[PDB]
């Protein structure tokens, strides 16, 4: 399962643009709240990675293979911050039903 | 101040009930 | 949940009234004699 | 006063009274109007 | 501050109620030494201070 | 909670007290006399008498009154509304003997030195010249003028500068001799007082006091002054009254509602009142708030929730005034309860009337008092984006 | 039921009174005022005061706010320069979860960075609302010019420090001043037992004595604020007695002799020697009183004047001259007896209310660890005698003064002229 997940990570292809997994999340309301709660350096790296991926997609290029994002290396930075947004979101919801 | 004058008279307009009105 | 249930129970009567108006309206407009 | 509190205060009921009245008004209007036209000509 | 200040108490006691005229909505400019300041402003010449 | 015991004297003056273990006491005199009993020729008589009442009586010429009540160590106080006038003293219980004799002078045997009269006139007038700074009071004294047009409930407690300047001892004497009758008076005591001692003191002093269609008009006043930084807007409908039972189900509704400074009020007078909301906002958002407010009132009218009602019942439960709140708060409640209801309603009866309130009767009473009603609107400040009367009146109801 | 004041071993001073009241009140008192900051973390106590409804380890901000409003209870924070007090109140049937919320807020905050970043704008708004009146600004200026390090720190956050207060500063302040030896949990309308159980599930883990504050040092001086107000406000104080001395009682008797607020509405407060000494010479509107603020290491006593700018000078001089008369022994025993009666009536009316009673017990706890029955105090105030009052006066008339003035100060005198 670990090797097949690495093979699917190579087949997804966002590592060839230098992106992380959390860069590829669709910005819903909860995702934008999690992005807003990021520290400044992580937010700046995320915006630069997104801009570089957009530029590479503009020129129809990819990064060189040494510059790709290694599956093992990818960091799920937004995840911790996101869970909270969802948790808080759900809590408010249940309370609504009260 | 705000008490120097009183609301102007609307007698020619006021109708001498709410439910019906 | 319970709150939304209260809301539904509170608005469904109003909603039924609205549907009633529509019934009269649609029928009158359609001139469907069956009604 | 009763009518207002019963069929004219709640907008839903306001619509109900309007629609129902209109449904019958046509019957009455057409009938009455026709009587007049016929009498005229 | 119950017997010591009395009337003056509310001046020494913030009381943010937390849970549970009003404030009236309470600049970036374009970009040492010692000597009495001397302000200068010109019709067209930008102003300056030569302290 | 100890019961409030009420007795009645020759004059008709009532002597109400509610003993408590706190040490000091708040002894006050209430009088059923306000701006509602004035007839536009003496529109500032109660206010100007409230200024003159501490400036000396025969027995206490000059500063004597203030001095003694100062020496004893008593923070005397007073106030006037559109329906009630109160003169109360907070003092160490043991001083009741003098806290009561002093109050007797203040209600009768008072001396309105013309000399003093002159100064108080100036005081009142000048303050009024500045009373305009209290925008909120302004908004609330027009929410009264435009809602009770043509009635004695439109006129303010202070009166118009005109009357203030044009007032004389005899006029005052009249208001004093006319609206200070013994059957319209309550001697209320709260805290460390004994009821029998207070009754004996009322028999000894104060036993001399002589024994002898308000309408709401759905309307609008707009005071536009664009130089002010913030706008204050009050919207009200006709409150049930003081005695009306539904007042309690309306208080719970206010507890459900609780832009900016969006307060809510249920002002009650004798079988009338103003029930509504006052909010201060930047001019550009007045429209939004007015709408939000409405949507909310409407929410309660058709879509209440037991949960929220509970939230409202509980907040109301923690508002009831009690010995914990202290003597003055309680006295004040004793004086208003004997003047308005004719009796002191205990907190257990308030709790029973709160717990009988559910969501169905709350939305029924809210539909009775808020839905499809013509409001009174009072705006002051940059109020151009404040909607006119058709938009507010249309927001007083929902199509759906 | 006399307060069952008991000091748990750690240091927390638990106290309670089962008044069988319908609405109870439970407060927690910490020696963590604004005097415990230094020049590197100014305004941290203001953000801590405004951060009572933040996410805690045990309850979120939404859960705390909706749970306190669900039962209709109240949570408030009152802060002086020495002490902070977090108070909850509500129906007896809901005070268990009210103590859950309050003890979570006191003991286990999280201080998330996005929450404090949202709170800094509220900090600015709260400071503007607080400085809407002249008395607050002139007292903050008076403390800033009167003291050097500790009590000179403002209650409200400075303008430059907004945007600079971090989560780490709040965490450091809480970890260094919210310890069990500086805390008293006081409950009116509750059983003492429960206070103890909540005092072990909470309030027992942080048990150091914390970070000791610096001794406050007097400096003297005068700070003036020309801002074109209609009235000139001026406070002139000097160093006085601290909390825990009979000279503090003498200074309280001295302010009630000089005048400490009107007792009659629209009165002229006739007796106030100050008010009399001003009113015999000036017919302009004025308001002259005596100011006293005593903290556990130092106190400030002086005069406070509001007057028309023009007369601002001699009115201040007249008030000062009156205190000099009291420094020369020119007083009567009936005046001191009336001052004692005013002071003791003010104390009894301060403790007559439930929240004032809870605050008093709280303060006494943190200050002396003991409860002093209202009665005891009465006889101690009586202990103060005429000469004692005179003595405190001479202290004021001699000690270097500190002056905070604001308004149109073209005719407001200076300290070397005063």
UniProtKB/TrEMBL annotation, chain A:
Subunit-level organization: Component of the ubiquinol-cytochrome c oxidoreductase (cytochrome b-c1 complex, complex III, CIII), a multisubunit enzyme composed of 11 subunits. The complex is composed of 3 respiratory subunits cytochrome b, cytochrome c1 and Rieske protein UQCRFS1, 2 core protein subunits UQCRC1/QCR1 and UQCRC2/QCR2, and 6 low-molecular weight protein subunits UQCRH/QCR6, UQCRB/QCR7, UQCRQ/QCR8, UQCR10/QCR9, UQCR11/QCR10 and subunit 9, the cleavage product of Rieske protein UQCRFS1.
Membrane topology: Peripheral membrane protein
Function of the protein: Component of the ubiquinol-cytochrome c oxidoreductase, a multisubunit transmembrane complex that is part of the mitochondrial electron transport chain which drives oxidative phosphorylation.
Subcellular location: Mitochondrion inner membrane
The name this protein goes by in its record: Cytochrome b-c1 complex subunit 7
GO biological process, one term: mitochondrial electron transport, ubiquinol to cytochrome c
Entries under InterPro entries matching the protein: QCR7 (IPR003197), QCR7_sf (IPR036544)
Alphabetical UniProt keywords: Electron transport, Membrane, Mitochondrion, Mitochondrion inner membrane, Respiratory chain, Transport
Main location: mitochondrion
Gene3D superfamilies, per database record: Cytochrome b-c1 complex subunit 7
MF-aspect GO terms: protein-containing complex binding
GO cellular component, one term: respiratory chain complex III
Pfam families the UniProt entry points to: UCR_14kD
Family (UniProt): Belongs to the UQCRB/QCR7 family.
Keyword Ubl conjugation: no
């Amino acid at each position: 399962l670990d090797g097949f997940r690495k093979w699917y990570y190579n087949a997804a292809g966002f590592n060839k643009l230098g992106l992380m997994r959390d860069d590829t999340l669709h910005e819903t309301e909860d995702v934008k709240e999690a992005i807003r709660r990021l520290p400044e350096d992580l937010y700046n790296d995320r915006m630069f990675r997104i801009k570089r991926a957009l530029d590479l997609t503009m020129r129809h290029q990819i990064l060189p293979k040494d510059q790709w994002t290694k599956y093992e290396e990818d960091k799920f930075y937004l995840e911790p911050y996101l869970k909270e947004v969802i948790r808080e979101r759900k809590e408010r919801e249940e309370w609504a039903k009260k | 101040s705000h008490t120097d004058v009183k609301v102007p008279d609307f007698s020619d307009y006021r109708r001498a009930s709410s439910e019906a009105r | 949940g319970p709150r939304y249930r209260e809301l539904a129970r509170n608005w469904i009567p109003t909603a039924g009234m609205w549907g009633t108006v529509g019934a009269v309206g649609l029928v009158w407009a359609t001139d469907w004699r069956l009604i | 006063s009763r009518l207002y509190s019963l069929l004219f205060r709640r907008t839903s009921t306001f619509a109900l009274t309007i629609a129902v009245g209109a449904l019958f008004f046509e019957r009455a209007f057409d009938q009455g109007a026709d009587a007049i036209y016929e009498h005229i000509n | 501050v119950a017997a010591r200040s009395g009337p003056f108490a509310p001046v020494l006691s913030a009381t943010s109620r937390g849970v549970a005229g009003a404030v009236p909505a309470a600049p970036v400019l374009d970009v040492a030494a010692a000597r009495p300041l001397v302000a200068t402003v010109g019709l067209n010449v930008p102003a300056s201070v030569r302290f | 909670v100890p019961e409030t015991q009420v007795s009645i004297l020759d004059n008709g003056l009532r002597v109400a007290s509610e003993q408590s273990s706190h040490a000091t006491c708040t002894v006050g005199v209430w009088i059923d006399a306000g701006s509602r009993y004035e007839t536009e020729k003496n529109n500032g008589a109660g206010y100007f008498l409230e200024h003159l009442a501490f400036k000396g009586t025969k027995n206490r010429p000059g500063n004597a009154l203030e001095k003694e009540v100062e020496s004893i160590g008593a923070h005397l106080n007073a106030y006037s509304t559109r329906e009630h006038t109160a003169y109360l003293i907070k003092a160490l219980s043991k001083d009741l003997p003098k806290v009561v004799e002093l109050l007797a002078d203040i209600v009768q045997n008072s001396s309105l030195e013309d000399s003093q009269i002159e100064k108080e006139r100036d005081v009142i007038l000048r303050e009024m010249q500045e009373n305009d700074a209290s925008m909120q009071n302004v908004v609330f004294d027009y929410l009264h003028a435009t809602a009770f047009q043509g009635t004695p409930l439109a006129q303010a407690v202070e009166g118009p500068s005109e009357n203030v300047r044009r007032l004389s001892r005899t006029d005052l004497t009249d208001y004093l001799n006319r609206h200070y009758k013994a059957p319209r008076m309550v001697l209320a005591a709260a805290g460390g007082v004994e009821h029998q001692q207070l009754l004996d003191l009322a028999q000894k002093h104060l036993s001399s006091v002589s024994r002898v269609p308000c309408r709401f008009t759905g309307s609008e006043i707009r005071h536009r002054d664009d130089a002010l930084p913030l706008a204050h807007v009050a919207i009200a409908v006709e409150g049930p009254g003081w005695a009306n039972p539904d007042n309690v189900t309306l208080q719970v509704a206010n507890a459900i509602i609780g832009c900016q400074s969006f307060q809510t009020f249920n002002i009650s007078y004798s079988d009338t009142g103003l029930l509504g909301a006052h909010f201060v906002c930047d001019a550009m958002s007045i429209d939004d708030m007015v709408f939000f407010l409405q949507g909310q009132w409407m929410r309660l009218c058709t879509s209440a929730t037991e949960s929220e009602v509970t939230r409202g019942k509980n907040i109301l439960r923690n508002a009831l005034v009690s010995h914990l709140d202290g003597t003055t708060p309680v006295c004040e409640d004793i004086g208003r309860s004997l003047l308005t209801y004719g009796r002191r309603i205990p907190l257990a009866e308030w709790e029973s009337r709160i717990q009988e309130v559910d969501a169905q009767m709350l939305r029924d009473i809210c539909s009775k008092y808020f839905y499809d009603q013509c409001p009174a609107v009072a705006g002051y400040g940059p109020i151009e984006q404040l909607p006119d009367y058709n938009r507010i009146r249309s927001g007083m109801f929902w199509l759906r | 039921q006399d307060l069952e004041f008991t000091k748990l071993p750690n240091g927390l001073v638990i106290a309670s009174l089962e008044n069988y009241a319908p609405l109870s009140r439970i407060g927690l008192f910490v020696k963590a005022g604004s005097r415990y900051e230094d020049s590197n973390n100014l305004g941290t106590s203001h953000l801590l005061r405004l951060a009572s409804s933040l996410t805690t380890k045990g309850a979120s901000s939404f859960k705390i706010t909706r749970g306190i409003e669900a039962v209709g209870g109240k949570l408030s924070v009152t802060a002086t320069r020495e002490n902070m007090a977090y108070t909850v109140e509500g129906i007896r049937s809901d005070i268990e979860i009210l103590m859950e919320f309050l003890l979570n807020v006191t003991t286990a905050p999280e201080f998330r960075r996005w929450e404090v970043a949202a709170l800094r704008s509220q900090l600015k708004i709260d400071k503007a609302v607080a400085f809407q009146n002249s008395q607050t600004r002139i007292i903050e200026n008076l403390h800033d010019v009167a003291y050097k390090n500790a009590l000179a720190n403002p209650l409200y956050c400075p303008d430059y420090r907004m945007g600079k207060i971090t989560s780490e500063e709040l965490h450091y302040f809480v970890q260094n001043h919210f310890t069990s030896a500086r805390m008293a949990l006081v409950g009116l309308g509750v059983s003492h037992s429960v206070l103890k159980q909540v005092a072990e599930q909470f309030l027992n883990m942080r048990g150091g004595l914390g970070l000791a504050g610096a001794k406050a040092k007097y400096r003297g001086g005068e700070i003036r604020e020309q801002n074109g107000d209609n009235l000139v406000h001026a406070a002139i104080v000097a160093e006085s007695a601290a909390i825990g001395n009979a000279e503090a009682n003498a200074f309280s008797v001295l302010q009630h002799l000089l005048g400490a607020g009107p007792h009659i509405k629209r009165g002229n407060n006739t007796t106030s020697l100050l008010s009399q000494s001003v009113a015999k010479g000036s017919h302009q509107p004025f308001d002259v009183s005596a100011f006293n603020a005593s903290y556990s290491d130092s106190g400030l006593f002086g005069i406070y004047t509001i007057s028309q700018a023009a007369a601002a000078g001699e009115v201040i001089n007249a008030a000062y001259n009156q205190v000099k008369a009291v420094a020369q022994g020119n007083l009567s025993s009936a005046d001191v007896q009336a001052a004692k009666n005013k002071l003791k009536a003010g104390y009894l009316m301060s403790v007559e209310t439930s929240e004032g009673f809870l605050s008093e017990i709280g303060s006494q706890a943190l200050a002396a660890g003991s409860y002093m029955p209202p009665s005891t105090v009465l006889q101690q105030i009586d202990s103060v005698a005429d000469a004692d009052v005179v003595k405190a006066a001479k202290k004021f008339v001699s000690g270097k003064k500190s002056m905070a003035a604001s308004g149109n100060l073209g005719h407001t005198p200076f300290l070397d002229e005063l």
